[PDB]
């Protein structure tokens, strides 16, 4: 059985690095992370631009 | 990194109060709740009407 | 077996009351109404504002 | 011909009043506003809760 | 309040049995499981075919 | 001209048999049923599991 | 309250005339038809081409 | 950079001519109109039928 | 088994004729074309307007 | 690089077997088939019922 | 109240830089730009590749 | 007439380079490639991360 968590990664560099920010957090706290699907992307526009990529990160349960 | 939980709040008064029911539960159990996005709304029709609002409630991890 | 009818309720007060307007019409004419799912919401803007909530109203056949 | 603007209204009371906040802004600046369609709803969760309703507000050109 | 987890069940027999695989895992670890909604279905095609059914499994919190 | 009714069939065996439950009800009450399109699938989880398949069932008018 | 029926009109001439085929059927059998929304379009390709336009046709109840 | 405006053209003849009604309005008021994407189609059913086609009309900024 | 190809037909006359442009190309090169489903429509706006209709054209394999 | 073909499998038994009908056709004609994603399901209702499952079948190019 | 404009940024380097191209144009002409949501991405394939990212860019009115 | 193929490009560097991986494969085997539309993005998480971008790559037939 796989389960997915819905995470939004951030980066001041690019949408790819914001996806990796989420995946790095998932791998810090979960075992058997196996893939991620991008569900939304956006940019927070303040003092700097922060690219955000929301991913469903799938991991295998057990 | 933000994470979202998918909660359905209920109310016998209105869709806004059913969104707040979910958010109040998230704030009981999670720190750093920052926003909610409505994903579905419906009404359970029994002895009384129960308005339901499903929200993805985002909180900042750490 | 359940069947759904696609109704748009109206109210000059709120989206929740326009959902209830549709459900009240369904319960006038159908037996065994059991739930409603909101599919669209809008506002007709004329002499007054009329909030509209479109619902699929499910009822059990028999 | 109708044209739509994509506005997000806010309210600390309810999703219906946040839709009306957007419509009131459209009617301040545009003539012949004729309807609004809700496209998204959410809640900003800070010191207080601010309900937000995003609407495409249609007005007739001429 | 209900909460949903996003699980992908697997089966080498059918999409219905892969939905039940997810639900059986949810019932192993959560109380008050009340319904599941199918969100995606697919087949992993290797040495054998593994049917997969992804479900949001809802359970009542408390 | 074809018209569609939105029915949810149920079965304690499988999603295919819950689609057939809806179609059997449509054929009991309507003439010239010609096809069905699956629009949603889910499982009610109580004393037993009840698989549900919602279909738009098309029939030719006349 | 408005209710919608889901009809597929046909024409061997064009998608506009297949929408009108559905609307003409609705007006034959229902009072107070007020608008139609196109939901799908397609072409049946046999001895001749038959353009099809599926519409939700709204009528006011009473 | 391109920008899109969301316009609904009307015609008593056909959906193609209602798309052209919107595009003709865009070309009256904007320079460098380059394409349009159909996003919705419908028919207003009153004394006469008025076909409507909503388009995002893209134009190049500068 | 049916297979679909994703084609965009063009016409300087109408969206129906741009669907037929795609279907005519499919019938030039494939046997047993049986139906087409419209998936997108748009207009290229240059020296002239070119209406485009994208269709999934289904044909039976064998 | 993976490429997907859009196939509709059929079966008089079940939606799972109609997915396998498509996959069996893909494996007859393509090398390195690796997965399939269900995109639509329906039932053709004639002398018998024919369950149909449309899948995007992915295969690795080379 | 926030309003969004629908802009397509371009870059010959990457999808992130094409999002920034749109945002830079919005900040040239609008005050109080606060966020952008990616709605579509594509690549124009001519003499060179031009990555395009379409964003709804939100700004606060006043 | 344009036709689209549905390809998933891969890269261990970024989503933009995985889109270019698909486009480079299309240009190896097809003439008159003219644009690509991103339809899905994801990351395969194994020994290394492999970013994947699925594109519909359009080419002009003739
Ligand atoms: C993708 C994205 C979506 C957002 N949507 C909203 C929104 O819907 N409402 C709101 O008050 N603030 C929002 N915000 C917050 C704006 C806060 N201010 C800022 O970024 O300068 C959003 C931010 C991001 C990055
Ligand atoms: C939004 C909403 C959706 C529902 N969908 C279903 C459903 O798909 N199937 C079912 O057996 N019961 C359902 N139910 C449960 C009906 C249970 N009875 C009742 O509300 O009187 C649903 C209830 C709600 C509020
Ligand atoms: C949600 C909503 C959607 C509408 N869409 C349309 C529409 O697409 N076209 C049209 O002529 N009139 C429309 N109308 C009717 C405008 C009629 N005039 C008015 O409300 O002052 C719509 C009305 C509502 C409430
Ligand atoms: C509907 C809604 C969506 C939002 N989405 C985002 C978002 O995607 N990213 C972000 O940094 N901040 C967001 N925000 C901003 C969070 C800012 N903080 C706060 O509300 O306490 C969003 C706010 C709202 C109301
Ligand atoms: C529904 C489904 C979707 C998949 N999507 C992908 C995918 O997008 N990319 C990838 O490298 N592998 C995938 N895979 C993994 C292919 C691994 N190999 C195999 O199944 O023989 C997917 C598998 C399944 C069952
Ligand atoms: C597909 C499906 C969707 C449902 N959605 C809801 C729902 O949104 N809210 C609710 O109160 N009950 C629901 N229910 C009813 C739960 C009633 N209890 C039970 O099944 O043990 C749903 C049931 C089904 C089968
Ligand atoms: C829009 C459209 C969709 C169709 N989809 C299907 C379909 O999914 N399966 C099937 O067996 N036949 C279909 N058909 C029926 C093909 C019957 N034969 C024919 O048109 O020569 C469809 C027909 C139309 C017009
Ligand atoms: C596509 C379309 C959508 C519409 N949707 C609505 C609607 O949602 N609510 C409403 O009061 N009136 C509507 N109307 C207005 C009906 C006004 N009366 C009429 O057309 O005779 C709509 C009109 C059109 C053309
Ligand atoms: C439906 C449609 C969509 C289009 N989308 C795009 C697009 O997203 N980006 C771009 O550079 N050019 C586009 N184009 C090309 C504009 C080329 N110039 C012209 O039509 O005068 C599109 C054209 C059409 C017909
Ligand atoms: C899923 C499915 C969708 C279909 N959609 C259509 C359709 O949109 N129009 C049409 O003329 N025939 C259709 N058909 C064909 C009906 C042909 N007759 C029959 O099945 O007895 C469809 C068939 C299937 C299985
Ligand atoms: C994302 C994207 C979408 C496009 N869609 C279309 C389209 O639908 N029709 C058309 O004639 N040209 C198009 N074009 C224009 C092709 C113009 N030629 C070229 O890019 O070499 C599109 C271009 C882009 C970048
Ligand atoms: C976007 C993406 C989607 C995937 N979806 C699935 C999936 O739905 N089921 C499965 O068994 N494997 C999958 N996989 C395969 C996991 C194989 N293992 C791995 O990547 O370590 C997917 C892979 C990718 C990149
Ligand atoms: Cl989710
Ligand atoms: Cl419906
Ligand atoms: Cl828009
Ligand atoms: Cl496709
Ligand atoms: Mg930096
Ligand atoms: Mg009360
Ligand atoms: Mg009042
Ligand atoms: Mg207050
Ligand atoms: Mg076995
Ligand atoms: Mg049994
Ligand atoms: Mg003729
Ligand atoms: Mg006339
Ligand atoms: Mg001409
Ligand atoms: Mg049999
Ligand atoms: Mg360069
Ligand atoms: Mg590297
Ligand atoms: Na989730
Ligand atoms: Na988002
Ligand atoms: Na729901
Ligand atoms: Na219906
Ligand atoms: Na509507
Ligand atoms: Na939003
Ligand atoms: Na999936
Ligand atoms: Na459902
Ligand atoms: Na259809
Ligand atoms: Na807009
Ligand atoms: Na519309
Ligand atoms: Na398109
Ligand atoms: Na289909
Ligand atoms: Na686009
Ligand atoms: Na395809
Ligand atoms: Na995918």
Numbering used by the authors:
A (entry chain A), B (entry chain A), C (entry chain A), D (entry chain A), E (entry chain A), F (entry chain A), ...: 2 to 63
Paper's wording?
Dodecin from Halobacterium salinarum is a hollow spherical dodecameric protein, which binds oxidized flavins with high affinity, whereas flavin reduction induces the dissociation of the holoprotein. Herein we use the riboflavin binding protein dodecin as a redox-sensitive probe to study ET processes through DNA monolayers. To study ET, dodecin can be reconstituted on flavin-terminated ds-DNA adsorbed on gold electrodes. If ET through DNA is possible, applying a negative potential will result in flavin reduction and subsequent release of apododecin.
Prior to adsorption of apododecin tE, a non-binding dodecin variant dA was added as a negative control to show that apododecin tE is bound specifically to the flavins.5b To minimize the ET distance between the redox-active isoalloxazine subunit of flavin and DNA, different flavin–DNA ligands comprising only the first five bases at the 5′ end (oligo 5, O5) and flavins of different lengths (CofCn) were synthesized. Dodecin was reconstituted with these ligands and X-ray structures were measured. In Figure 1 A the structures of the flavin–DNA ligands CofCn O5 with a hexyl, butyl, propyl, and ethyl group (n=6, 4, 3, 2) at the N(10) of the isoalloxazine moiety are shown. For all the flavin–DNA ligands, electron density can be traced for the isoalloxazine moiety (and the first two CH2 groups). For the CofC2_O5 ligand further electron density indicates binding between apoprotein and linker plus the first two DNA bases. As shown by superposition of the ligands in Figure 1 B, the (rather deep) position of the isoalloxazine ring of CofC2_O5 in the binding pocket is similar to that of lumiflavin, while all the other flavin–DNA hybrid ligands superimpose with riboflavin. For electrochemical measurements a ligand with n=3, bound only by its (oxidized) isoalloxazine moiety, appeared to be the best compromise between high affinity binding and short ET distance. Efficient ET could be observed even for larger distances between isoalloxazine and “molecular wires”, when the flavoenzyme glucose oxidase was reconstituted on gold electrodes, but using molecules other than DNA (e.g. single-walled carbon nanotubes) as the molecular wire.5f, 9 In the X-ray structures there was no electron density for most of the linker between DNA and flavin indicating that (also after protein reconstitution) different orientations of DNA and redox-center relative to each other are possible.
